[PDB]
Amino acid sequence: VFHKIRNEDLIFNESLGQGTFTKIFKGVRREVGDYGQLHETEVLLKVLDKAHRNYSESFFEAASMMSKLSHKHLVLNYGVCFCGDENILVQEFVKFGSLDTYLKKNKNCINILWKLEVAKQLAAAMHFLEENTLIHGNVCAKNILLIREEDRKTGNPPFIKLSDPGISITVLPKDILQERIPWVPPECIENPKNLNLATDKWSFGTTLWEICSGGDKPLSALDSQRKLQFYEDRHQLPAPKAAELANLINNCMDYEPDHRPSFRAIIRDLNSL
Numbered sequence: 333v334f335h336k337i338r339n340e341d342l343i344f345n346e347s348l349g350q351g352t353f354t355k356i357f358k359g360v361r362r363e364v365g366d367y368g369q370l371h372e373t374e375v376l377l378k379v380l381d382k383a384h385r386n387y388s389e390s391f392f393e394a395a396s397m398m399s400k401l402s403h404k405h406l407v408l409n410y411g412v413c414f415c416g417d418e419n420i421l422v423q424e425f426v427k428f429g430s431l432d433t434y435l436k437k438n439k440n441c442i443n444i445l446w447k448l449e450v451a452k453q454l455a456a457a458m459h460f461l462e463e464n465t466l467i468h469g470n471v472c473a474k475n476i477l478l479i480r481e482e483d484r485k486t487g488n489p490p491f492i493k494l495s496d497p498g499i500s501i502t503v504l505p506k507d508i509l510q511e512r513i514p515w516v517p518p519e520c521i522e523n524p525k526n527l528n529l530a531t532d533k534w535s536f537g538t539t540l541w542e543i544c545s546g547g548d549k550p551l552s553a554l555d556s557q558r559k560l561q562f563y564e565d566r567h568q569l570p571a572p573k574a575a576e577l578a579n580l581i582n583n584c585m586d587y588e589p590d591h592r593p594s595f596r597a598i599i600r601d602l603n604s605l
C-alpha cells in the first residue's frame with residue numbers, strides 16, 4: 333500500500349514549523365468525488381528536509397505502515413507526493429496541533445480527568461498496534477495530536493490521534509539518539525537494532541510523564557552526555573509535581589525489557605482510577 337497524489341492536486345497554504353528532519357505545511361487536496369464534483373479537503377503536508385534526503389527510505393516506510401492501518405486514534409495518511417524534487421507525505425489535518433504545546437499553553441486549566449481520558453485514547457491505539465504486532469518507534473507528546481478539545485457541556489471528551497512514526501531510530505546517528513533520552517529506551521541506546529514491541533511501552537511511560545507534568549520535557553536541563561549516564565546508573569524518572577500517574581510510569585519504564593506490561597493491562601489500570 334502506497335497511494336500517490338499528483339502535485340497538481342496539492343495547494344500549500346501556511347507553514348506550521350519545522351520538525352524531526354521535516355517541515356510542516358497546511359494545504360488543500362483537490363479530489364474529484366462522485367457525480368463529477370471536485371471535493372477539496374484540508375490536509376497536512378509533511379516535506380522531508382532536502383538536506384536529509386538520505387533518510388527517504390525510512391521516511392516512506394513510515395507512510396506505508398500508517399496507510400495500511402485504520403484506527404480511531406491514528407492519524408490517517410492520504411498518500412505520498414513526489415512533488416518536484418521533494419518527498420512529501422499527505423495526512424489528515426488536525427486542528428489543534430501538537431499535544432505538548434497544548435499542555436504547556438493550558439497547564440493550570442487541565443483537569444486530571446482530562447489527562448486520564450487522553451491516556452486512555454493513546455493506550456487504545458498502542459493496544460491496536462500490539463494486537464497487530466506492529467512497532468511505532470516514536471511515541472512522544474510532540475507526535476500526539478488533538479483534533480477536539482474538551483467540552484464538558486456537550487459531554488464529549490477531548491480527542492487525540494497519534495501521527496506517523498517518522499524516521500526510525502535504527503537509522504539515526506548516535507549523536508541524535510542520545511539527545512532523545514528518555515524517549516529512546518535504554519536497550520536501544522546500547523544497540524539501535526533492538527527495536528521491539530516493548531520499546532514503545534517505555535516511550536508510553538515517558539509520554540505519560542509529559543502529560544502528567546503539563547508539557548514539561550523530562551531531563552531537559554541535562555545535556556546529551558549526562559542523559560547517557562542516567563541510563564547506566566539505572567536512575568528512575570523523578571515523579572512529576574502532580575504525582576498521580578507516576579506509579580504506573582515506573583512500571584512501563586522498567587529497565588528489564590520484558591517486564592513492561594501489556595496495554596490491555598494498562599487500559600485496566602486507567603479505568604480502575
Ligand SMILES: O=C(Nc1c[nH]nc1-c1nc2cc(CN3CCOCC3)ccc2[nH]1)NC1CC1
Pocket residue numbers: 348350351356376407423424425426427428429430474475477495496
Ligand atoms: O504530524 C505532525 N502534525 C500534524 C499531523 N496532521 N496535522 C498536524 C498538525 N496540525 C497543526 C495545526 C496547527 C495550528 N495551530 C494549532 C494550535 O494553535 C492554533 C492552531 C499547528 C501545528 C499542526 N500540526 N507533527 C507535528 C508538527 C510536529
